[PDB]
Structure 1
Amino acid sequence: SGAIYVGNYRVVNRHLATHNDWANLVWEDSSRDLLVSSTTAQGCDTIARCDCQTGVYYCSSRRKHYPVSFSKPSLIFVEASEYYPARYQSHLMLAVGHSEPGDCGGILRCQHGVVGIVSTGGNGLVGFADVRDLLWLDE
């Protein structure tokens, strides 16, 4: 679990969005596993606008932060799950690191701000949904 809170927006994994997220929907994209809902309170986070390929993510299944080198956002094949059919997920960045399904929503940050959230994993890999190209989150 986990979300990004920026301005009057809440960014969550689309497969973990609640009834309240869908009732206050701003934008969603199944191919990216992202959903953004509106909030009444001002958020605590800020978004990186950079090309960093290293950073630190929070792993709830270890209660620890880990440093990572990750690939540039790209279209990657993701096996079928209870939430989606087998498909290509876009804007996904991979890194070597521990993750379990409940780790989705953990934030990946660099020195500039939030880069993305955990969205995929397995066999010593962890995949993050990028949010740096969503410029409208800042206005």
Structure 2
Amino acid sequence: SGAIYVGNYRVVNRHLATHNDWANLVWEDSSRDLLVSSTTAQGCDTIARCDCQTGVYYCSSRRKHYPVSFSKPSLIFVEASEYYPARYQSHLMLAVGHSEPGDCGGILRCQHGVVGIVSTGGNGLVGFADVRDLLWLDE
């Protein structure tokens, strides 16, 4: 679990969105595993606007933060799960690191701010849904 709170927006993994997220829906993209909902209270998380390929992510299944080198956002095949059939997930970045399904929502940050959230993993990999291209989150 986990979310990004920026301005009047809440960014979550689409597969973990709640009834309240869907009732206040702003945008969603199944191919990216992202959903953004509106909030009444202002958030002050900062989104990175950069091309960093290193950062640190929070891993809830270890209660620890880990440094990572990750790939640029790209279209990657993701095997079927109980939430999606087998498909290409877009805007996904991979890195070597520990992740389990419940780690989804952990934030990846660089020195500029929030880069994305954990969305995939397995066998010593961790995949993050990028949010740096969503410029409208800042307005």
DSSP 3-state at the match of 2:47: coil
Larger displacement relative to structure 2 (39-48 or 28-37): 39-48
Deviation, 1:134, is 0.1
DSSP 3-state at the match of 1:20: helix
Q: What is the alpha-carbon distance in structure 2 between the residues aligned to residue 110 and residue 8 of structure 1?
A: 22
Deviation, 1:27, is 0.1
Deviation, 1:111, is 0.1
DSSP 3-state at the match of 2:21: helix
Structure 1 gap segments, 5+ residues each: none
DSSP 3-state at the match of 1:84: coil
The question of 1:36 aligning with 2:32 is answered: no
1:17 is aligned to 17
Deviation, 1:125, is 0.1
Q: What is the alpha-carbon distance in structure 2 between the residues aligned to residue 102 and residue 111 of structure 1?
A: 26
2:123 is aligned to 123
RMSD: 0.3
Q: What is the alpha-carbon distance in structure 2 between the residues aligned to residue 46 and residue 55 of structure 1?
A: 15
Q: Post-superposition, which runs of at least 4 consecutive aligned residues in structure 1 deviate over 4 A?
A: none
Give the structure-1-normalised TM-score: 1.00
Structure number with the higher strand fraction is 2
- Cα shift readout 1:56-109 (whole Å, capped 9, x = no counterpart): 000000000000000000000000000000000000000000000000000000
Q: What is the alpha-carbon distance in structure 1 between the residues aligned to residue 121 and residue 79 of structure 2?
A: 11
2:114 is aligned to 114
Q: What is the alpha-carbon distance in structure 1 between the residues aligned to residue 46 and residue 69 of structure 2?
A: 21
Q: What is the alpha-carbon distance in structure 1 between the residues aligned to residue 60 and residue 13 of structure 2?
A: 15
DSSP 3-state at the match of 1:136: helix
Deviation, 1:44, is 3.1
